[PDB]
Design a protein around this ligand. Structure first.
Ligand SMILES: O=[N+]([O-])c1cc([AsH2])ccc1O
Ligand SMILES: [Cl-]
Ligand SMILES: [Fe+3]
Length: 119
């Protein structure tokens, strides 16, 4: 039972939390200066808002697939490595108010993806 992760670099975090509460009909799961997240049931979605220091507009920070356990993260790592993708693995790695196992790739046009579990 995994979900898409969508992490956005937003110019106004406060306006953004406001807007996403309305769009999804639910408040954030977590709020800390310069960061918020929403854990959305339908559609399955982890929405990450990161506050950008003076960009004009919202832009993509990264994308992701949140899996159920580290076991799934490692399957995904081996499978992606086997398909010929350049990968970067991380274990028990702090970051944004959580600990995660993750594997990272980048699409041809430079957009970053992580397959990850939050521990
Ligand atoms: O790419 N990252 O490692 C990354 C990780 C976290 As946590 C937040 C923003 C980012 O761009
Ligand atoms: Cl963008
Ligand atoms: Fe993140």
């Amino acid at each position: 039972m995994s979900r898409v992760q969508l992490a956005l670099r937003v110019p106004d975090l406060e306006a953004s939390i406001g807007f996403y509460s309305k769009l999804f009909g639910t408040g954030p799961a977590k709020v800390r200066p310069g960061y918020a997240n929403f854990a959305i049931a339908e559609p399955p979605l982890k929405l990450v808002l990161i506050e950008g220091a003076g960009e004009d507009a919202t832009r993509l920070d990264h994308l992701g697939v949140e899996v159920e356990d580290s076991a799934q993260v490692g399957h995904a790592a081996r499978r992606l490595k086997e398909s010929g993708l350049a990968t970067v693995e991380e274990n028990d790695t702090a970051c944004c108010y959580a600990v995660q196992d993750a594997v990272w790739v980048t699409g041809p046009g430079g957009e970053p993806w992580e397959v990850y579990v939050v521990k």
